[PDB]
From a paper:
Using single-particle analysis of the complex we obtained the 3D reconstruction of AC9–C4–M (AC9–C4 complex in the presence of 0.5 mM [name]-GTP) at a resolution of 4.2 Å. The structure revealed all the previously observed features of the AC9, including the 12-TM domain region (TM), the helical domain (HD), and the catalytic domain (CAT). The [name] binds to the C2a domain of AC9 at a site that partially overlaps with the Gαs-binding site. The variable region of [name] inserts into the groove formed by the α2′ and α3′ helices of the C2a domain of AC9, similarly to the way the switch II region of Gαs binds to and activates the enzyme. There is one major structural difference between the structure of AC9–C4–M and that of AC9–Gαs determined previously: [name] does not appear to stablise the occluded state, in which the C2b domain of AC9 displaces the nucleotide and forskolin from their binding sites at the C1a/C2a domain interface. The structure of AC9–C4–M revealed density in the active site consistent with the presence of [name]-GTP, as well as a lack of any density in the allosteric site. In contrast, in the case of the [name]-bound state, the full-length AC9 could be captured in a nucleotide-bound state. The binding of [name] to the C2a domain of AC9 leads to a small rearrangement of the C1a domain (RMSD ~1.2 Å), particularly prominent at the flexible “claw” region (β6α5β7β8) of C1a domain. Close to the “claw” region, the helix α4 in the AC9–C4–M structure also moves outward (RMSD ~1.7 Å) compared to AC9.
Adenylyl cyclase 9 (AC9) is a membrane-bound enzyme that converts ATP into cAMP. The enzyme is weakly activated by forskolin, fully activated by the G protein Gαs subunit and is autoinhibited by the AC9 C-terminus. Each membrane AC contains two conserved cytosolic catalytic domains and twelve predicted transmembrane (TM) helices, with cytosolic N- and C-termini of varied lengths and regulatory roles. Here, we present the cryo-EM structures of AC9 in several distinct states: (i) AC9 bound to a nucleotide inhibitor [name]-GTP, (ii) bound to an artificial activator ([name]) and [name]-GTP, (iii) bound to [name] and a nucleotide analogue ATPαS, (iv) bound to Gαs and [name]-GTP.
Numbering used by the authors:
A (entry chain B): 9 to 136
B (entry chain A): 97 to 197, 217 to 262, 278 to 359, 384 to 552, 566 to 574, 780 to 939, 976 to 1250
C-alpha cells in the first residue's frame, strides 16, 4: 500500500479487540483488507480472539468473506477449528463458501470435527 | 609489456596487410592516372616521366604479389620502409624537373599530401620514425619546390598536414591496441567463467543430489533460484532408510592426531560414496560418529531396499577391510527401515537437502537396536525380502524386527582530442589565408573576417563544452550540465560536428570570393589550401562515415567545380583529376577508420558483458561456499587438500520442534506446508545468524527439524580487546533470543504454540571437513554427542545445561534452577539445570 501501517495497526486492533480503536482507524480510513506477512486477514485475527462485535465493526469496514491466510486457511477454517457458532453465522450470512477447502485439501467443515466442534459442524451441514 | 605487445602485432597482422594491399593498389591507380594524363592530354613531348611511371607501377605490383610470402610475416616493417623510401624518391624526382616558367606545383602537392598520408596511416611505422621521415620529406620537397610570404605559407600547409598526420596516427594506434587488449580480457572471461560454472556446479551438487540440482540448474521458475544470491519439497513413499554409527566411537577416537581420525574417516566415507554410486543410492548426511544414506527417494526403486541392504553389507566388508588394515576394530550398528518420507530443503543458511518422517526416527531407533556388524531390519522391510539371505527374527534382547548378518582513448576522450585537432589546424590554416595579405595592408574582404569570427565563436564554445564534459570544473552551474549535454546525443552530435569540421573549408573560401584568377599564383595557392582543408575532413572519426565523407566531397570540391565556371583554364582539368583521386583516398581511408572505431566500441561492449557475467558467477559461487563452509577455514582446502583443527571449548545446542510431531498430523496431503512453516522459523533463525552481534555463532546443520549451533571457533585472533570466555555468553543469549523468536512466531501460527526443547554442552571438539569432489563440514569430540544426548533428554522451554557449563555461566551471573542428575550414556550421572527461572508456576 502507501504507508500500510494504518492497516497494520488495524490488524492488531482486529486481533486484540480494541473496540473504539477500530472505529478510530476506520475513521482514519485504515486499510480494511490489509494483511500480515503470513497472509492473515482481520477476520483471521478476529476469529482467533473471538471479538464478534469487532468482526461486525470490521464488516462495517468491509473486509473479505473468503480470504485465506498464506497458509490457505480461511477464517471459516479457523472458526471451524475454534468453536464460536455465533461468529460463524455472520459469515454464512455474508455468503461464505461451503464446498471449498484450504491448501490442506479438506473442506473447512471437517475442521470443526478437528476439535469436534459439532456446534459449527452442524451449521455447515445446513448449507451446501 | 614487451612479450605481450609482441603478440599484439602478431594478431593485428592481417588487417595491416590488407591496408598495405589497398595502399599499394591506390599508389598504382594514382601513378597510372598520372601516366595516362601525361600520355594523352599534355606532356606528349617527353618520356622522362612516363617510363618512371610504369616502372613504379610494376615494382608496386611486384610488392603486391609479394605480400603473400612467408619470409615477410615478420618483415612488414622493413617492407614498408623500402616501399616508402622508393615512393619518396619517385615523387621528389618527378618534381624537381620544374620551375622554368609545365607541371603545376599543386599537382606536386597532391603527391606530397597523399604520400604523406599513406606514410602515416597504413605503413604501421614507429611514431618517432614515421615522424622524422615525414618532416624530412616535407622540408626536402618544399626545397625542391624552391628550384617572402608564399614560401612560408606552403611550409605552414605542411605543418598542419603533419598535425593531422600524427593525430590520426596515435588515434589509430591506440584504437587497435585497446581492441586487442579488450579481446584478450574477453577470452580470459570466457575461460574463467566456464571455470566458475564448473566450481559452482561442484558445490551445488555437493549439497543436493543429482535430479534436484539438475532440475534447478535450468531455472525454469526464475524466482526460485534467487535464494542462491526459492525451493520445492516432495513426499515419496517406499524408501530405504539406512543408518550407521561408529560403535564405541569415543573409544576408537580416544587419542588421535586431530587429523588421523579425520583422514581415515574421509577414507571410509569416500569408500561409502564409491559404494552408493554402484548401488545408485543417495547418500545424505553424516552425524559425527554416524553416517547415513537413503534410497528410493528421487526414484522409488523396485529393489530400493535391496540396493540399500546389500550396500550396507558391502560397507561391512569395507569396515572390516579397514579394521584389519589400520588396526582399529570398530564396525558399525545398522538400522534399516522403510515407509514414506517427505524430502525437500529447509533454511537459507547452511541449508541442505534433507528428509523427514516418522520412518526417519524409526530407522534411527532400529539402528540403536541394531547389533554391531548386522542389521536390525523391519517387517516393513521384510515385506519383500524375498527370503534370499540370512533372515533371523532379531528382537530386543530386553516390534516386527529381524537381524540380518547378510548371506586512454575513451570514446569521450577522442572527442576533446580531435576537436582540439580541428580547431588548431583550422586556426593555422586561416593564419595562412590571411598571410596572403602583403598587397592589401589592412585585410579588405568582409566575408573573410565575418566567417573568421563566426568560426572562432563556435569553436571556442564547443571546445569549452568538451573540456568541461571531461575535466568537470563547474564554472557556473551544474544542473544545467545534466540538462544540455543530454541533448548532445547520437544525432545532435552529428550536426554540431558536421558544422564544426566543415568550417575550415569555408574559412579558405572566405578569401577566394574576390576575383583572383588573374593572378594564377593565387589560384594555385587557394587550390592547395582547399585540398588541405578537404584533407582535414578525416579527423572527426567518432561521427558517421558516409555522411562526413560526402560532406567532404561536396563542400570541399563542389565549389571548385564551381570556380570551374570562371572561364585558370585547364589547370581546371588537372585539379579535377587531383581531387577525384584525393577524394577516392579520403573515402576509403575514412571508411576503414570508421570500421576501426565501430569494432572498438563493440569490443568494449562485449568485454563489459563478460565482466558483469563473471561478477555474477563469482558472487554466486563464493557465497555458495560461505553457505557450505565458513570462510576462515575456507582457506585450507582452497590452498591445500584438507583441513582440521581442535577447539577445547565450544558451546553446542540443539533445538527441535517437539509439538510439531503432533501438529505433524497428516490430514493435509503431504504435510508439506507445515514444513513450510518450520522453514519459516528456520529462516527467522538465519535472520539472526546474519546479525553481527551474532558473529561468533555458526549453524552446523539442520537435522530433521533440529538446529545444531556452535561458537568459539572462527575468531582465532586473540586480541587484547576481549575476554575469551565471552563466546558462550553471547551464545546462550542468542539462544534465549531465538526462544523468544519461536514465541513471536507462534503469536502468528493459528491456534498452535510450537515449543522447543534445547540441550547444551561446551568443551573440547574437533573441527573437520570431509568431502572432496564433494564437501561436508562437521564437528566431533565429547561435546557433540554429550549435548546431543542432553537435548535428546531435555524439557522444553527450559534450557538444559551441562554441569560445568552451568558453572561457568553461573559465574557469568545467569540464573538457573536445578533439574536433576540423570544418567548419561557411557558417562553416568550428570547434574543438569534449566535456565528459565519461575517461567512456569513450578
Amino acid at each position: 500500500h502507501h504507508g500500510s501501517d494504518l492497516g497494520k495497526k488495524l490488524l492488531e486492533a482486529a486481533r486484540a479487540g480494541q473496540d473504539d480503536e477500530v472505529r478510530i482507524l476506520m475513521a482514519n480510513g485504515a486499510d480494511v483488507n490489509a494483511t500480515d506477512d503470513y497472509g492473515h486477514t482481520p477476520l483471521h485475527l478476529a476469529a482467533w480472539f473471538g471479538h464478534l462485535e469487532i468482526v461486525e465493526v470490521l464488516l462495517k469496514a468491509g473486509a473479505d468473506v473468503n480470504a485465506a491466510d498464506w497458509l490457505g486457511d480461511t477464517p471459516l477454517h479457523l472458526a471451524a477449528r475454534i468453536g464460536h457458532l455465533e461468529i460463524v453465522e455472520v459469515l454464512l450470512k455474508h455468503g461464505a463458501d461451503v464446498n471449498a477447502q484450504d491448501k490442506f485439501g479438506k473442506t473447512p467443515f471437517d475442521l470443526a470435527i478437528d476439535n469436534g466442534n459439532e456446534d459449527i459442524a452442524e451449521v455447515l451441514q445446513k448449507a451446501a | 609489456s614487451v612479450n605481450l605487445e609482441e603478440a599484439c602485432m602478431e594478431r593485428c597482422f592481417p588487417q595491416t596487410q590488407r591496408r598495405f594491399r589497398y595502399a599499394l593498389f591506390y599508389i598504382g591507380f594514382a601513378c597510372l592516372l598520372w601516366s595516362i594524363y601525361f600520355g594523352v592530354h599534355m606532356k606528349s613531348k617527353l618520356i622522362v616521366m612516363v617510363a618512371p611511371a610504369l616502372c613504379f607501377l610494376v615494382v608496386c605490383v611486384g610488392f603486391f604479389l609479394f605480400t603473400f610470402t612467408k619470409l615477410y610475416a615478420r618483415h612488414y616493417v622493413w617492407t614498408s620502409l623500402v616501399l616508402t623510401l622508393l615512393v619518396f624518391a619517385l615523387t621528389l624526382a618527378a618534381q624537381f624537373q620544374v620551375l622554368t616558367p609545365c607541371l603545376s606545383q599543386v599537382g606536386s602537392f597532391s603527391m606530397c599530401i597523399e604520400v604523406l598520408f599513406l606514410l602515416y596511416t597504413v605503413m604501421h611505422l614507429p611514431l618517432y620514425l614515421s615522424l622524422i621521415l615525414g618532416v624530412a620529406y616535407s622540408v626536402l620537397f618544399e626545397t625542391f619546390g624552391y628550384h617572402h610570404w608564399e614560401l612560408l605559407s606552403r611550409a605552414l600547409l605542411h605543418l598542419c598536414i603533419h598535425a593531422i598526420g600524427i593525430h590520426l596516427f596515435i588515434m589509430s594506434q591506440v584504437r587497435s591496441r585497446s581492441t586487442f587488449l579488450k579481446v584478450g580480457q574477453s577470452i580470459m572471461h570466457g575461460k574463467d567463467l566456464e571455470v566458475e560454472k564448473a566450481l559452482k556446479e561442484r558445490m551445488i551438487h555437493s549439497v543436493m543430489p543429482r535430479i534436484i540440482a539438475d532440475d534447478l540448474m535450468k531455472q525454469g521458475d526464475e524466482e526460485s533460484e534467487n535464494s542462491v544470491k526459492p525451493f520445492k519439497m516432495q513426499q515419496i513413499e517406499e524408501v530405504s532408510i539406512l543408518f550407521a554409527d561408529i560403535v564405541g566411537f569415543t573409544k576408537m577416537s580416544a587419542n588421535k592426531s586431530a587429523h588421523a581420525l579425520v583422514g581415515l574417516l574421509n577414507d571410509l566415507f569416500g569408500r561409502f560414496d564409491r559404494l552408493c554410486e554402484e548401488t545408485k543410492c543417495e547418500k545424505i548426511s553424516t552425524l559425527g560418529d554416524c553416517y547415513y544414506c537413503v534410497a528410493g527417494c528421487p526414484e522409488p526403486r523396485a529393489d530400493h531396499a535391496y540396493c540399500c541392504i546389500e550396500m550396507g553389507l558391502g560397507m561391512i566388508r569395507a569396515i572390516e577391510q579397514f579394521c584389519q588394515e589400520k588396526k582399529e576394530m570398530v564396525n558399525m550398528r545398522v538400522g534399516v527401515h522403510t515407509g514414506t518420507v517427505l524430502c525437500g530443503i529447509l533454511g537459507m543458511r547452511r541449508f541442505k537437502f534433507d528428509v523427514w518422517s516418522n520412518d526417519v526416527n524409526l530407522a534411527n531407533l532400529m539402528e540403536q537396536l541394531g547389533v554391531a556388524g548386522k542389521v536390525h531390519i523391519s517387517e516393513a522391510t521384510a515385506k519383500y525380502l524375498d527370503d534370499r539371505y540370512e533372515m533371523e527374527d532379531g528382537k530386543v534382547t530386553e516390534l516386527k524386527t529381524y537381524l540380518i548378518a547378510g548371506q586512454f582513448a575513451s570514446a569521450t576522450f577522442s572527442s576533446l582530442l580531435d576537436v582540439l585537432l580541428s580547431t588548431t589546424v583550422f586556426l593555422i590554416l586561416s593564419i595562412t589565408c590571411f598571410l596572403r595579405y602583403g598587397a592589401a595592408s589592412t585585410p579588405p574582404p568582409p566575408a573573410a573576417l565575418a566567417v573568421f569570427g563566426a568560426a572562432l565563436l563556435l569553436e571556442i564554445l564547443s571546445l569549452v563544452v568538451s573540456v568541461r564534459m571531461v575535466f568537470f570544473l563547474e564554472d557556473v552551474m551544474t544542473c544545467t550540465k545534466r540538462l544540455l549535454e543530454w541533448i548532445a546525443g547520437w544525432l545532435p552530435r552529428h550536426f554540431i560536428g558536421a558544422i564544426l569540421v566543415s568550417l575550415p573549408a569555408l574559412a579558405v573560401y572566405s578569401h577566394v570570393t574576390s576575383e583572383f584568377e588573374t593572378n594564377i599564383h593565387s589560384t594555385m595557392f587557394t587550390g592547395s589550401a582547399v585540398l588541405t582543408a578537404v584533407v582535414q575532413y578525416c579527423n572527426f572519426c567518432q561521427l558517421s562515415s558516409w555522411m562526413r565523407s560526402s560532406l567532404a566531397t561536396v563542400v570541399g570540391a563542389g565549389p571548385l567545380l564551381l570556380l570551374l565556371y570562371v572561364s585558370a583554364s585547364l589547370i581546371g582539368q588537372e585539379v579535377i583529376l587531383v581531387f577525384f583521386l584525393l577524394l577516392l583516398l579520403v573515402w576509403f581511408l575514412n571508411r576503414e577508420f570508421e570500421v576501426s572505431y565501430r569494432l572498438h566500441y563493440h569490443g568494449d561492449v562485449e568485454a563489459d558483458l563478460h565482466r558483469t557475467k563473471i561478477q555474477s558467477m563469482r558472487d554466486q559461487a563464493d557465497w555458495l561456499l560461505r553457505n557450505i563452509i565458513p570462510y576462515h577455514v575456507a582457506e585450507q582446502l582452497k590452498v591445500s587438500q584438507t583441513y582440521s583443527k581442535n577447539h577445547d571449548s565450544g558451546g553446542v545446542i540443539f533445538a527441535s520442534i517437539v509439538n510439531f510431531s503432533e501438529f505433524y498430523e497428516e490430514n493435509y496431503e503431504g504435510g508439506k506446508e507445515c514444513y513450510r512453516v518450520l522453514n519459516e522459523l528456520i529462516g527467522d533463525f538465519d535472520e539472526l545468524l546474519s546479525k553481527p552481534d551474532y558473529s561468533s555463532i555458526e549453524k552446523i546443520k539442520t537435522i530433521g527439524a533440529t538446529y545444531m549451533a556452535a561458537s568459539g571457533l572462527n575468531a582465532t585472533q586473540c586480541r587484547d580487546g576481549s575476554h575469551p570466555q565471552e563466546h558462550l555468553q553471547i551464545l546462550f543469549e542468542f539462544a534465549k533470543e531465538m526462544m523468544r523468536v519461536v514465541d513471536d512466531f507462534n503469536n502468528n501460527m493459528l491456534w498452535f504454540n510450537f515449543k522447543l526443547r534445547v540441550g547444551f554442552n561446551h568443551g573440547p571438539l574437533t573441527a573437520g571437513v570431509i568431502g572432496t569432489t564433494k564437501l561436508l563440514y562437521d564437528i566431533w569430540g565429547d561435546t557433540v554427542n554429550i549435548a546431543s544426548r542432553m537435548d535428546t533428554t531435555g524439557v522444553e522451554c527450559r534450557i538444559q545445561v551441562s554441569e560445568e557449563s552451568y558453572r561457568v555461566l553461573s559465574k557469568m551471573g545467569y540464573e538457573f534452577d536445578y533439574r536433576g542428575t540423570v544418567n548419561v550414556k557411557g558417562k553416568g550421572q550428570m547434574k543438569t539445570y534449566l535456565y528459565p527461572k519461575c517461567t512456569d508456576s513450578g
